[PDB]
């Protein structure tokens, strides 16, 4: 709950980023998914440490643009 | 040494591992069926034993969920 609230409050001040407007604001799962996705992107190709965080992000998102974007990322260009 | 279902390391049968169990004297509203002279819970809304929480610890395992060596705590 603490990390969820912190991610929700951190979301607004990332106005410019990679794929920011594909995660909506009025859903908590998508805020948390954006946190995980941005934390994973701060890495290089898999190394089994980026894929873990992408799979964590996919297990909590609840929109559809979030889902097809994270699928574009984790599985196939 | 209660064992739930088939023999195991005595997961206590009285609760089947729940540790907590439903309290005996509250039905639905955590109400007290019992009426007693003290009257604190006699009137109705609050169950005397669990004070409305609707569960207690299991008496056989004391909430541990298993017996064997650790009947204790």
């Amino acid at each position: 709950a603490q990390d969820l609230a912190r991610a929700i409050k951190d979301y607004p001040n990332r106005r410019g980023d990679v794929g920011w407007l594909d995660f909506d604001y009025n859903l908590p799962g998508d805020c948390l998914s954006f946190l995980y996705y941005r934390q994973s992107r701060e890495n290089k190709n898999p190394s089994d440490q980026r894929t873990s965080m992408l799979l964590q992000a996919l297990g909590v998102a609840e929109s559809e643009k979030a889902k097809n974007r994270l699928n574009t990322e984790l599985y196939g260009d | 040494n209660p064992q739930g279902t088939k023999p195991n390391s005595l997961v206590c049968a009285n609760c089947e591992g729940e540790g907590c169990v439903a309290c005996s004297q509250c039905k639905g509203g955590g109400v007290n069926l019992i009426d007693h002279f003290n009257g604190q819970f006699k009137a109705g809304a609050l169950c005397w034993l669990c004070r409305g929480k609707k569960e207690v610890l299991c008496g056989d395992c004391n909430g541990a969920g298993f017996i064997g060596g650790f009947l204790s705590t």
Binding site: - | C23, S24, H36, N38, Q40, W48, L49, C50, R51, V56, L57, G59, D60, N62, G63, A64, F70, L71, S72, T73
Partner: protein
Amino acid sequence: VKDYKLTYYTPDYTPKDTDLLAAFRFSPQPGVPADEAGAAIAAESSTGTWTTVWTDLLTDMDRYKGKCYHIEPVQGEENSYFAFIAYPLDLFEEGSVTNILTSIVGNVFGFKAIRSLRLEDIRFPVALVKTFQGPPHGIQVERDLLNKYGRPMLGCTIKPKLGLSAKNYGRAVYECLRGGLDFTKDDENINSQPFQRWRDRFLFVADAIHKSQAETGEIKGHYLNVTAPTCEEMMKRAEFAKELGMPIIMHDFLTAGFTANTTLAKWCRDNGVLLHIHRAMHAVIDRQRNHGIHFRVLAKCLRLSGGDHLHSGTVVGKLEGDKASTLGFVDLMREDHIEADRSRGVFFTQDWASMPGVLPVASGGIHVWHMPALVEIFGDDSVLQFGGGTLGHPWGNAPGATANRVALEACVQARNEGRDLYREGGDILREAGKWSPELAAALDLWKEIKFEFETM
């Protein structure tokens, strides 16, 4: 030595009153007699020779030699014997338990021709008892310091909870002590660990003790655990605990050793605190019935080294094959003269020379329906620890303490008037649990036990 009777197995020998006797139970390898094995156990615990090729130049012989004076078979078991051997008094240092241990059980337990070896008892002469200090205070002084006469004392360990903040720890201790208990015990795994360092725990526990004792009117305590990595760290914890004004501390006498326990007992004797000993890591030594060191030997060594309370384990759930042994070594550490009786495990007649006694602590998953039994079995001079039978009351910490207090006083007051406690335990408790809601709730949560047909 040869067909000549080994000069170590001398059955016509009767021991002096200044000899340390020891009784081993051994089981030998196939194809080895019993007498040879007895004499070999006698020769391993001392000079490791049967002959005189080393140990005779001018007179250095027959003075530091462990004769073996009795061998008999165990009843029931086959290929299993008792060997009684007897050591002189000049082999042992004055005031050291380490030396006695490393001289008896030093390297005999690795003898190859023996299949298994157990040390069942031991007898210290009075001449050796009087060079040790003994318990700091004892039973009568320990009862007079706290001003608790008649009844046994109550305590409540806080074991299930883990990771507690120091302040919530102090809070739970306060709620227990205020409700009507006497002592309260730290978990024995709790030392200074990153979630709860020791000085904060000591501070908040001391504050709780002062508050509850001031607003109740009697003397309360809490066994603070001063087990440490070094002699310096341990003495530092103990000094700080005395500064706050604490009556009693705690220690682990098997993982920390006997040197540290002797040092701490001398400090406690100088500074006037009581010492509570916690037997941890003991089943590693005395669980199997065919190898190790039975526990009554360690109880004697602790009465010698130092300690006022000692964990001895309950007997409510055992048969008379082991209830007998536990009652035996509970008498071995309270009285002053114990006569030899093999049904209760006592092998030798031991006289303690007016050294004080220790106090047995009965613990581990007990609740109110056991209080009738424990009261008579262990007697007035015992401490009763309630792990879960207190903290789990349906509505709090203080009510659980009140319930246990009420039950105890009911049982003891009833025993004073001649009523039986085997026939009339349940109805005593039920008659008492009528003018008090706490005891009623407690009786309803747990379940009656019905010891046996009508007694024991």
